[PDB]
Design a protein around this ligand. Structure first.
Ligand SMILES: [Mg+2]
Ligand SMILES: [Mg+2]
Ligand SMILES: [Mg+2]
Ligand SMILES: [Mg+2]
Ligand SMILES: [Mg+2]
Ligand SMILES: [Mg+2]
Ligand SMILES: [Mg+2]
Ligand SMILES: [Mg+2]
Lengths: 386, 386, 386, 386
């Protein structure tokens, strides 16, 4: 029941099942996984592919010969399993050199190094077939007000993304960028903290068509925002290039629980939206198996990510297909929300006495919205109580 | 000491000092203020002007003759005092007809009424000299997932703002719009919940040059965001048309405390930014005197708004003018943040072996940022300990 | 399916289905309900009983003769329907006189009035058969630091509850008190803000056996706390006298959604705990039907409260009865958590070399907890996927 | 100006200035400090003493001979500098064996090991002169609902603290315990999450007089609570045995900023309370110098902790000594809050017609509280604007 297949397009980062369990108060509880073993085990679970930071695949500082060895072994595991690599990204946060950021470090030489490190991994991503290149600026930000002039930092961030766009254009690469927002952690405040801030920033880039967002469930919930609403705005703007799925219990540290944990009803409404809108990209899981777990629990937690997506997919589909729900949607006037307010135009609106002078406001105000009956139908469907 | 003058451009909404103290758990503690008395008392405190919702000035349902009487009395108080009206807005949230929103109500007839009510007040705002027209969509949103299709609602919101822009264009009015974001309250989630979401939405309007943001201190802090950072992004995009100042103690209900209360250090960094960037618009206070207060406390709380801005202005100016601070800013490389990362261009960067092949990452990583010394200088200046 | 009966002990406040929809930004959307009609309609839905504030039943300021008329009509509706009144409470928050609190108002004459108003309603509660008397100090608190000396205010709060205990003791009444915590709203910070603070305060009262807590789902979640955990501590201390059920979406204004909305998984774990622990008191709903709703939606939202409790009860029971779950609980060592750490005593522990000198820490650390498999079984049961 | 002396009783944990900068997303930015060097440098800054976890001083796994060497070197640095060790604590969170907790681990053998590890360090603390022994149960908690039965876990937590109390009693030690609450991180929810929950738990211990709380500024603010209010309740109960000072910017990960950063006004009201109440214990800083800093920034950040306390001490003292403030306090009736509500007793209250039958509620309600004028005097004093 609810078994994934590679046609479901489920993907996982190497750093997810490979997380050793080191947290700010404790040492690792699990040994390191060989990327090749992770590819094999994920393929057996029904995954479609994997993603990586440069430093997940090729340890930092590797020689060019060591680098080719790591890539060759990885490429062989992909050939043996049929797994794909749809997305790649750059680690610009672990090494101490990035302690004040990568693209927006105050030190100019660090910003130049950050760009060269990114460009080298874009070449590798293209070689392995990635369609999307993610940028998470986890160190771009500040703990104190005077440390970062944010207008100058946004100039530097625009400069870096513009240069990356010039690079992929000049090389003829068919790859697009997705910016991943996060409000805080590990910096006290991170630049571009939500989906909205990232979407607004993209419109000031030289080639905006090359850039979209990679929102993550838990990150928007770290600001107490409604994740399905933010995804809807990203889809409305045509900018949902990729998505990271996980779980989060409210406003606190980034928990990265398996998908379906955390806010379960928000997960239901997210799956409903993605499937209704026909989102075609990977269903990527950026999660951490809790450090309480051994390797058997790692694979159980990864399987649960996919299982929970498929259960919610079934329940949302049953909800939308239910004739009683379709009738409730009409009773709450969702059909009228989809019709233009004034297709007759401004002048007709101004001359329409039924829109103001003769509008019965008391009769309109007395109409109930019937939203609670609709939401209880949604509850019953989620819980399998119809 | 720290006495405001009308050249300081401090403004107040009629609904601020006029708040009767009704909250969700209690009845009013103060009687209603006549708008004329509020104008007179604010002028004596040193304010520059006032702002209004249509329904603050002209009670809902007034006849055309009653309406002219209310406006004439108001215009006379402005002439007698020298007060200005730089901003106006529409009440699309109090009346029960707006219980599911104004521009994005599911009912089409309500959306048409909302537009006609707004258009009528734009005419009045222009007559009284307002330069900015604010839109706060406080009822645009949902408490449950199925009640609002957010892509359709954004279509309806874009339709409404586009029609308003066509109206002001066709009338030849010199007025601009500012969208006021809020994450929640009174709806469970509100559409366009942060400055970032509003900025991104504006770029999809037909005439984006007519629209900017009106951020409010407490609203961004209701999502745990850094308000100075959000203001910096708005300034970077050229979209800070107006600003609402108040105080808020963290993530909870919208408190609307007087400016300077709440997060005091954030207030310091906000004033530093506005004065450094040369923001020219009104310093508007959207605050509520606590319902514990009588009318003497109302005026004391309004005076405190202005006093706290002027004290912080002095401390931020002393901070930036201090030679020891200028030297600390260079020590933390704020000068290098303002220089281009790669004015030499992409190809020069790619050929620069000092940017990657021969870059000493360990030497760069060992450089301290000196941010804590800089932040303690900022503390000492804020507290007057130098 | 899932139909409530009065043996399920579901109760509702008069102020819940009777909420007219007035919020801080909008006027009422529904007319007022006669308490008699609410009793009748709740009885038809399957409720067990109702609760009231004094001012819900007898309008503020009523004459003694008007008061007897209101009570007589109410008592007749109870006799006609079979409904019970298991809990009553005092309104010490709506009237302007209580704007700085009731029991901890700075004005001494207000504190004396608050006590007399409470005592008069305790007599009425006993007459109507209430077993529990709830105190929610919604105005006890402050918006600013100097306004309230909290040690003096706690002295005044202890004084008031001690006097109430002396009153019920002297009258021979069989009624107990339950303190309802809330962290904020309508005051900026409220005294006794969480279940823990209330439990600690009770232990300093003269007759602690007369006092317990009345926790509310949404209130603990307004501080980001785990509501099932707090309930477990209240049960562990023997102090869960009553409980208020509703829903809340994270850290924001008090939403009072119907039970099951908000954090659905927390609702599941709460029902599991209450049923496992054999909690015997009322399942009381303190919720507000959204102001979008007409009266048909009011009754639909009230029915949904009860439906969601009964569905979750079924799923939690199936979870605990599943042999595969019982085996998973043993695999995660929940059986060992219930055994004493050192029933052999301190000296035996100190002499036990297997507890320190010869303890294999690396072997113990390598044991996986198997919590993710257990939690996915819980998910599958909640969703009806087994 | 504002120079600390050891009579100010400022203390620091070895783990604070010794933090190497490892966070969940990045490697260490600073080398390790020798405890002896930290003692010397803190003594030169004006500190009174230091605190330690067992594993800060004696690396985990040390032989008995290595252990005596580490202690002897440490004792010599204390003799050379005059520094004191007023508090010690146990590391029950870093080693993987503690991944499901120490005192409340599901595995019984782990709970026994946790107790033996604690008991061994209590002996060392007494030898070095510590008066308080802190317990922070950072791993006691859960990420999922079924993993931890909280009633059983509280039984195990009570068992462990009772055994520790029996141990210190049997040894004749003059040391007391302080429980440190935290709401979350590194567990998803931590048991005893706030000061209130810890105070309530203590009252169920066998020898409650031996146990108090060690609240931390940032931890209560992680739940959005008012830290001065919580400290006032701890003082009211006689349980403030120790305190941890730092800074925190709202509800997010535990930032551990230097004291005075974060919520500055809350720091002002905290210092006012501690000095007014005559708190006599150490002013202990549990903070982390940001990983952006080199060792010069470490010592600058530690100095700033002490400087900010001394500046706030001066401003709070000036506030309370100002005759205009004393008059404002009387105007807001803080004097009446300190008087008994009903020293005349219950029967006199019941017979007092001025308390109910003849009480003018409208006249009392019309009295303004004058809190905004009082709070602006407090602002002016904090900022040095009088
Ligand atoms: Mg994350
Ligand atoms: Mg991610
Ligand atoms: Mg506001
Ligand atoms: Mg505003
Ligand atoms: Mg509530
Ligand atoms: Mg309640
Ligand atoms: Mg901390
Ligand atoms: Mg601490």
């Amino acid at each position: 029941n609810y078994q994934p297949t590679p046609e479901d397009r489920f993907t996982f980062g190497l750093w997810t099942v490979g997380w050793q369990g080191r947290d700010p108060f404790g040492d690792a509880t699990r040994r390191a996984l060989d990327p090749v073993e992770s590819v094999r085990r994920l393929a057996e679970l029904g995954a479609h592919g994997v993603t990586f930071h440069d430093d997940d695949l090729i340890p930092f500082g590797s020689s060019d010969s060591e680098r080719e060895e790591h890539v060759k072994r990885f490429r062989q595991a992909l050939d043996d399993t049929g797994m794909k690599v749809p997305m790649a990204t750059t680690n610009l946060f672990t090494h101490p050199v990035f302690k004040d950021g990568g693209f927006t470090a105050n030190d100019r030489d660090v910003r130049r190094y950050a760009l060269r490190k990114t460009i080298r991994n874009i070449d590798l991503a293209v070689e392995l077939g990635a369609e999307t290149y993610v940028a998470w600026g986890g160190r771009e930000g500040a703990e104190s007000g005077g440390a970062k002039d944010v207008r100058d930092a946004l100039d530097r961030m625009k400069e870096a993304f513009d240069l990356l766009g010039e690079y992929v254009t000049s090389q003829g690469y068919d790859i697009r960028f997705a910016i991943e927002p996060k409000p805080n952690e590990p910096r006290g405040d991170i630049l571009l903290p939500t989906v909205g801030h990232a979407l607004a920033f993209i419109e000031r880039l030289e080639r905006p068509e090359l850039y979209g967002v990679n929102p993550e469930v838990g990150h928007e919930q770290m600001a107490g925002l409604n994740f399905p609403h933010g995804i809807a705005q990203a889809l409305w703007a045509g900018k949902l290039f990729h998505i990271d799925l996980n779980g989060q219990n409210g406003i606190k540290y980034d928990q990265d629980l398996r998908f379906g944990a955390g806010d379960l009803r928000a997960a239901f409404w997210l799956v409903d939206l993605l499937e209704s809108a026909g989102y075609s990209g990977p269903r990527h899981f950026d999660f951490k198996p809790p450090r309480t777990e051994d390797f058997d629990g790692v694979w159980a937690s990864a399987a649960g990510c996919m299982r929970n997506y498929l259960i919610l997919k079934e329940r949302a589909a049953a909800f939308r297909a239910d004739p009683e729900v379709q009738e409730a949607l009409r009773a709450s006037r969702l059909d009228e929300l989809a019709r233009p307010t004034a297709a007759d135009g401004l002048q007709a609106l101004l001359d329409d006495r039924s829109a103001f002078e003769e509008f019965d406001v008391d009769a309109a105000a007395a109409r109930g919205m019937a939203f609670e009956r609709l939401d209880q139908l949604a509850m019953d469907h989620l819980l399998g109580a119809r």
